[PDB]
Amino acid sequence: EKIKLLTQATSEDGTSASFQIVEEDHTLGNALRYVIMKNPDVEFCGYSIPHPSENLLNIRIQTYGETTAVDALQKGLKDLMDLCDVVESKFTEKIKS
Amino acid sequence: RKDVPKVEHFATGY
Amino acid sequence: LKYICAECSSKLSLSRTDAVRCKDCGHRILLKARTKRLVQFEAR
Amino acid sequence: GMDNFPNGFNAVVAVISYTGYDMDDAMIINKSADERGFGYGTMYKTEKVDLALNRNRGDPITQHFGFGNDEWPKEWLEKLDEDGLPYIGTYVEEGDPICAYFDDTLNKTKIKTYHSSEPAYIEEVNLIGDESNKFQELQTVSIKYRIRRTPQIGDKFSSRHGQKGVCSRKWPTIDMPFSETGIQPDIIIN
Amino acid sequence: ENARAEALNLANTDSQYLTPTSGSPVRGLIQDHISAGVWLTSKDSFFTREQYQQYIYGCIRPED
Amino acid sequence: VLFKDGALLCGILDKSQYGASKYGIVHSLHEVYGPEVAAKVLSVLGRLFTNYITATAFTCGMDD
Amino acid sequence: IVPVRCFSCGKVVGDKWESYLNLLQEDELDEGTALSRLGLKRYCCRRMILTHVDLIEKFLRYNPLEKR
Amino acid sequence: LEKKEGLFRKHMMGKRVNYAARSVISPDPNIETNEIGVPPVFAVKLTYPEPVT
Amino acid sequence: ARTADFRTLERESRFINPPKDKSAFPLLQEAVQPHIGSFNALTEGPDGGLLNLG
Amino acid sequence: EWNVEKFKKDFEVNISSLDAREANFDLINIDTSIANAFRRIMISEVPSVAAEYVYFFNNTSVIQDEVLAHRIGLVPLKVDPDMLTWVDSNLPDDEKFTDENTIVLSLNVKCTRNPDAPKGSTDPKELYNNAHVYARDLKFEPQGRQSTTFADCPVVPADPDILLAKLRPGQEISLKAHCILGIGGDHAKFSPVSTASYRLLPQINILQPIKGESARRFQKCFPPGVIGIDEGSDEAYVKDARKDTVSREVLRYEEFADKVKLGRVRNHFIFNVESAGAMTPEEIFFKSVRILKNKAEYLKNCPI
Ligand SMILES: [Zn+2]
Ligand SMILES: [Zn+2]
Numbered sequence: 001e002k003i004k005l006l007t008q009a010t011s012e013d014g015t016s017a018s019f020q021i022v023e024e025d026h027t028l029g030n031a032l033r034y035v036i037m038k039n040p041d042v043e044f045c046g047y048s049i050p051h052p053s054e055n056l057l058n059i060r061i062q063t064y065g066e067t068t069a070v071d072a073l074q075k076g077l078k079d080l081m082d083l084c085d086v087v088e089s090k091f092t093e094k095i096k097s
Numbered sequence: 098r099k100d101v102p103k104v105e106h107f108a109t110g111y
Numbered sequence: 112l113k114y115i116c117a118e119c120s121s122k123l124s125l126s127r128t129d130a131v132r133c134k135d136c137g138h139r140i141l142l143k144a145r146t147k148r149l150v151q152f153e154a155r
Numbered sequence: 156g157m158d159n160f161p162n163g164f165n166a167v168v169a170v171i172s173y174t175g176y177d178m179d180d181a182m183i184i185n186k187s188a189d190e191r192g193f194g195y196g197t198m199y200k201t202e203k204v205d206l207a208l209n210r211n212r213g214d215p216i217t218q219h220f221g222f223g224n225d226e227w228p229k230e231w232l233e234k235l236d237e238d239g240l241p242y243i244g245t246y247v248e249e250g251d252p253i254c255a256y257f258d259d260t261l262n263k264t265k266i267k268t269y270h271s272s273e274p275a276y277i278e279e280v281n282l283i284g285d286e287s288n289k290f291q292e293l294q295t296v297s298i299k300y301r302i303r304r305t306p307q308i309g310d311k312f313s314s315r316h317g318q319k320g321v322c323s324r325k326w327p328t329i330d331m332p333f334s335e336t337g338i339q340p341d342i343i344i345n
Numbered sequence: 346e347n348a349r350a351e352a353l354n355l356a357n358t359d360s361q362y363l364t365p366t367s368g369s370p371v372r373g374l375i376q377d378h379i380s381a382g383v384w385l386t387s388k389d390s391f392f393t394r395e396q397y398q399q400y401i402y403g404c405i406r407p408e409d
Numbered sequence: 410v411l412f413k414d415g416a417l418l419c420g421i422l423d424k425s426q427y428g429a430s431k432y433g434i435v436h437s438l439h440e441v442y443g444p445e446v447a448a449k450v451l452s453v454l455g456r457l458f459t460n461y462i463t464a465t466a467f468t469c470g471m472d473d
Numbered sequence: 474i475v476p477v478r479c480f481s482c483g484k485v486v487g488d489k490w491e492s493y494l495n496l497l498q499e500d501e502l503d504e505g506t507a508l509s510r511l512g513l514k515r516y517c518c519r520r521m522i523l524t525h526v527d528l529i530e531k532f533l534r535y536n537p538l539e540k541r
Numbered sequence: 542l543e544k545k546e547g548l549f550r551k552h553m554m555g556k557r558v559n560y561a562a563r564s565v566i567s568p569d570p571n572i573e574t575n576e577i578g579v580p581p582v583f584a585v586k587l588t589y590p591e592p593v594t
Numbered sequence: 595a596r597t598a599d600f601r602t603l604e605r606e607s608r609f610i611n612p613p614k615d616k617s618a619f620p621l622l623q624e625a626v627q628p629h630i631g632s633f634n635a636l637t638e639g640p641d642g643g644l645l646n647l648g
Numbered sequence: 649e650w651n652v653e654k655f656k657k658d659f660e661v662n663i664s665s666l667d668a669r670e671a672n673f674d675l676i677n678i679d680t681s682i683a684n685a686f687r688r689i690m691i692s693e694v695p696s697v698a699a700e701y702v703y704f705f706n707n708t709s710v711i712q713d714e715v716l717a718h719r720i721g722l723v724p725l726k727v728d729p730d731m732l733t734w735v736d737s738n739l740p741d742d743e744k745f746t747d748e749n750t751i752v753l754s755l756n757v758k759c760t761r762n763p764d765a766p767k768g769s770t771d772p773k774e775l776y777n778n779a780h781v782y783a784r785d786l787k788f789e790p791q792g793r794q795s796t797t798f799a800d801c802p803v804v805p806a807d808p809d810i811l812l813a814k815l816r817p818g819q820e821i822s823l824k825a826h827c828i829l830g831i832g833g834d835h836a837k838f839s840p841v842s843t844a845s846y847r848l849l850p851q852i853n854i855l856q857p858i859k860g861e862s863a864r865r866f867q868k869c870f871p872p873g874v875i876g877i878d879e880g881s882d883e884a885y886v887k888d889a890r891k892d893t894v895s896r897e898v899l900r901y902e903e904f905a906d907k908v909k910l911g912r913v914r915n916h917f918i919f920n921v922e923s924a925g926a927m928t929p930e931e932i933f934f935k936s937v938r939i940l941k942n943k944a945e946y947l948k949n950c951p952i
Contacts, residue, residue: 005952009408018408021947026330027688028943034681037395038650046402050409051571052324060402070952077948079652083682084940086656091937094661094673095930104596107514108893109337109847109920110665110672111873113237114282120540125239127221130293131284139284142537145243147706147822150713154700154721154825155190155835156619158605161526167481167517172467175459175570178377187836191480192718244704244713276713303714309565323567328836329688332466335894337845337920338517341481345377359448359575362439370436372448372574373428374455380467381458386421396464404457452574459570474711475811477722483842484922485724488783488809498603524600529814530609533710538818610770 005070009060016044016062017069024057025049032059035083036076041067117142163315164194169340173332177345180320182312187328188341189306198302199278204254204267205295218258218265219292225263231255235266240280240296247300248274254296275300312342320344410434427454474529481517489513493522560587664890671929674890675846675917683846683917689936690844692832695729696926698722699753700837701826709821711813719813720825721837723783724806724924727751729840729935731797732829745826747792751803753825754787759815776817784808786825806925840932842922849916850892856907858884866904869897890918 006018021028029047036045044062061069112124118138131139174183184193210216220239222231234245235252247253250268257264278301282293306312306322313319331339354360364371374382384390392400410420412434427435435454439447477487489511496507504523513519542548562583569578608618617623637643658677665672675683702717709716733749759778772779788803813821830838852874858866863884867875876887894912898904921929 002950003947003952006408019952025688027685027693028947030681031685031940033395033399034679037398040649044398044402046399048403048406050406052330058406058408060408074948077944080944081941081948082652083655084937084944086652086659087661088934088937090656090659091661091673091933094663095666097663101597102595106893108871108891109335109845109918111891115537117281117537120538127219127292129290130282131290139286141282141284143240143243143280143282144538145706145708148242148244150244150246150704150707152702152704152713152717154698154702154717154837156622158526158601159531161528164480165520165524167520170468170470172377172380172462175377175462176568178375178568181568185481187483187839188480190836191478191483191722192476193480195715195718197712197714244707278712301712308567321565321567327692327833329692329833333845335845335847336515336517337843338481338515339843357575359444362444362447369431370429370433370439373430373435373451374458375428377462377467378455378458378570379424379428381462382422382427382454384465384467385458385461386417400457400461403460404453406456448574455570455574477719477810477812478836479842483836483839485807485810485842485924487811488807490811491809494602494606504600504602527606527609529710530606533814533816534612536816536818538708539816 006058013065014068014070015065016060018058018060019073021057021059023055025055029057029059032076032080035080036061036072038079039072039075042069042072113144113146114141115144166193166342167338167340168342168344169332170344171332171340172345173343174324174326176323176326177320177343180318181323181345182320183323183326183343184306184312185328185331185339185341186325187339189325193341194306194312196304196306198300198304200275200300200302201297202300203295203297206256207294210294215291216294217260218256219294220254220256220296222255222257222264222266225257227255227264231266240298241277243277243280245277246274247277253298256294271300273302275302277301318344427451474527475525476521479518479521481520482515484513484515484518486513486518486521489522490525490527562587666930668928669923669925671919671921671923671933673919673921674849675919677915678917680914680917685940686933686936687844687846689939690841690921690932691839693939694832694840694932694935696830696832696838696840696924697725697727697729697732697751697827698830698835698837699725699825699827701828703824703826705756705822705824707821707823709813709815709819716813716821716823720786720823721835723786723810724926725827726804726806726925727798727801728927729829731801734829747790747794748797749828751794751827752789752791753803753827754789754823755781755785755812755825756822757781757785757815758820759817761817772814776815778815780814781812781821782808783810783812785812840924840926841929842924844919844921844932846917846919847894849913849918850889850894851911851913852886852889852892853909853911854885854907855909858904858907862903866898869901869904870895 002022004020006020010017026049029049033045033047036042041063042061043064044060046060048058048060050056050058059073061072063069063072112122114123114125114130115121116123116133116136116138117140119133119136121133121135122144123134123141130141131137133141177183206216206218231252233251234241234247235255236242240254241247241252247269249271252266253269255264255266277298279299281297281299283295283297284293285291285295308322308324310322311319312322326343328339331343333339358372362370362372410422410426411418422434424430426433430436435447435450438450475487475490477485479486493507493511496502496510497504502510508519508522511522513522564580567578572578635643636645639647641647655677660676662674662676663671664674699721702720704713704717707713707716711719731748732751733746735744735749737744757778759776761776762774765775769775783805786805788798790798790803815821832838832840859882863877863882866884867877870892873888873891874886876885877883878885894910896910898908899910921933923929923932927935
């Protein structure tokens with residue numbers, strides 16, 4: 001589907017893994033990298049693009065242990081969801097004024 | 098020689 | 112019906128004969144005319 | 156009076172090494188700016204079609220334009236659809252029936268193929284008459300092909316200073332760098 | 346497959362990093378990357394944890 | 410430049426160091442680890458300077 | 474053949490060609506003030522109205538369907 | 542069997558070939574140095590006879 | 595004032611209404627002049643151009 | 649320990665010049681990553697409607713069919729995107745289009761000279777009727793439920809004054825368009841925003857006490873609404889940072905080179921969103937943020 005994990009570069013314990021995303025670009029990648037790196041648990045986080053012509057995004061997460069990189073992913077997206085949700089309420093109020 | 102004669106931009110939201 | 116004169120610019124028709132002869136001009140050059148035909152396209 | 160024959164366009168160029176897809180002489184066009192129609196030169200090509208090339212003076216040819224009373228293949232009326240010639244407005248693909256002539260030598264009609272590379276549109280089909288009083292059946296036709304040349308990658312653009320280069324890649328507008336005023340440059344040179 | 350092996354092992358570009366004319370190399374980055382290296386490796390460059398990790402991952406991509 | 414145990418410590422990269430020049434860092438890396446590792450290093454440098462130059466572009470102007 | 478959409482920015486300028494002509498001719502002005510009153514601020518927009526050869530007038534009078 | 546256009550230097554010391562192509566080059570740093578950029582038009586065109594194991 | 599000018603009004607007027615008198619920008623005429631002058635002097639000369647003399 | 653609550657507490661908005669056509673709101677205490685993500689989503693991803701799949705019944709005008717089709721496609725409509733549905737694109741053409749997934753436009757203009765023309769007149773309107781073809785000539789002949797739904801929403805161009813083509817006597821044009829939803833990235837014709845850029849709030853760090861007429865000439869370098877003069881002590885000072893474009897004109901003068909560093913704050917984005925007539929800038933901005941939220945939610949929900 002849209003998201004997949006790379007068993008080639010995964011770790012045995014799952015504390016380090018890399019994910020590939022379809023139909024994405026810097027737009028989602030930079031924001032998601034920021035949000036994930038906000039989490040102090042993860043050790044290494046970053047996004048990569050195979051080739052600009054292809055609409056593929058590759059994201060790699062290496063935690064400091066005790067947390068599955070998959071969990072660190074869904075933790076980031078939920079924070080991202082709230083992050084793009086607070087602005088709506090904050091922006092809506094300023095419209096009322 | 099006579100020099101070339103002379104001729105006798107807002108931020109966003111302004 | 113078609114085949115504008117391109118000299119006097121008058122629509123006409125052919126009869127397998129004297130395609131040169133523009134009845135008003137006689138000019139030996141004739142020019143075809145676009146008709147009502149569907150032409151699909153892409154706006155890109 | 157050169158203004159009566161203008162050519163080229165003013166482009167918002169940026170002397171910047173940003174994408175990295177241009178080191179020697181390549182250049183990058185803004186993809187949206189292309190989609191706006193940044194440069195849309197077109198090719199007009201005409202060729203002469205006739206059947207008197209083998210005809211001699213005193214021997215009228217058994218073959219002439221049109222087609223009928225035969226078992227000619229159907230679907231030719233897709234674009235080869237009229238008593239004499241194809242429609243002006245049509246999208247000729249490769250091998251499409253350019254023109255049909257009924258032949259009595261074979262007692263059946265034969266057609267002329269496209270025999271080209273790029274699919275094109277018919278721009279103008281005109282009827283040419285013999286200079287002499289050779290009324291006959293007008294076995295001489297000239298048609299014009301319209302070819303749309305949208306600028307793809309590798310198409311040589313240039314300035315007025317010999318800084319010729321090729322279109323490296325249609326860089327997407329969002330990924331294109333922007334300025335304080337919000338303008339996104341269309342032409343990038345290294 | 347014989348020609349495949351010849352190209353991949355004898356005619357491949359990596360095997361030809363040098364030139365028999367004088368033994369000097371012929372392959373490398375040219376102008377944009379040279380300027381980028383000059384600017385990046387200068388002492389006036391500093392990168393936070395985010396920038397450093399992002400550059401390293403984008404440059405490496407170990408999954409490949 | 411002064412490498413030491415696979416670590417840059419002084420100087421900056423250049424055309425002489427990497428690109429097409431003799432006795433460069435990439436040349437020595439070839440000499441040590443074979444041609445394959447040198448080719449991978451050149452590819453990685455090309456990727457890095459491309460990503461880096463996008464972050465901070467390089468440009469020449471009339472002021473220069 | 475007035476460019477309908479701004480090439481670089483994207484501000485619609487096709488409608489503004491006739492208005493620019495009227496503002497230039499009927500009222501005595503200069504091009505800068507004419508574009509200002511027309512409502513163009515960035516030169517990415519100002520191009521397609523400051524410089525546009527109207528090759529439809531010269532290119533159009535060669536009509537084939539009307540007697541000369 | 543002639544001076545410079547002879548059968549040797551035209552059909553024996555050089556020949557036209559199958560499964561070949563020619564085009565222009567667009568630089569692309571985003572590819573590995575030991576790799577080449579093959580458009581999809583070539584991909585459906587050039588084929589390789591490979592046995593089924 | 596200005597060193598150059600677009601002359602948009604002149605260009606549009608000329609496009610709409612081609613001149614019925616001497617054409618504008620005469621320099622083009624006296625840029626193709628040599629060929630026209632040669633071909634005219636071939637017949638438009640003091641005595642049968644040059645063809646009659648030849 | 650950065651957190652959602654900390655971000656909410658620190659984040660604030662300042663709408664400056666909201667308008668039915670243009671917006672100039674500010675973003676404060678947010679990261680360039682999210683700011684640029686919003687910019688890109690607004691420019692590309694925000695859906696809109698524009699004409700494509702144009703069908704020509706007849707054309708003889710000087711302008712070519714391809715050029716005319718592209719020109720028509722590059723038109724801003726008025727219908728809101730949230731009234732139409734996407735097309736599967738893998739269907740037969742008859743099934744490819746319905747009432748609620750596309751709209752239909754017709755032009756069918758004919759031009760002929762009007763005999764009543766003043767002598768010595770060059771105006772095409774007087775010389776011939778239908779001399780020019782405008783956007784408003786485009787109709788929106790509906791189908792099925794569209795008649796009921798668009799009763800208060802007549803599909804009209806966002807700019808009916810644009811010049812599609814010019815005609816002549818004996819010159820006729822007849823076509824038929826099919827506008828669908830766009831995704832922007834597919835083609836710039838689907839761009840609900842003319843431009844959705846942003847600029848970081850300029851920062852001016854005055855070090856020396858700038859006083860006297862030398863302060864006045866320092867006032868001159870910047871735009872007029874930026875620098876202020878302290879009447880209390882004849883001191884130059886910053887009055888409004890947003891009023892300044894990044895000009896660096898002071899850097900040219902040697903006296904002020906050491907007296908000020910032209911910095912720039914890193915968490916103050918001066919958004920500036922123009923728009924076509926399809927939607928208002930506030931509406932498209934809300935669409936963009938909701939699109940980002942939907943992207944995140946879909947990415948979370950899709951398993952690996
Ligand atoms: Zn006639
Ligand atoms: Zn613009």
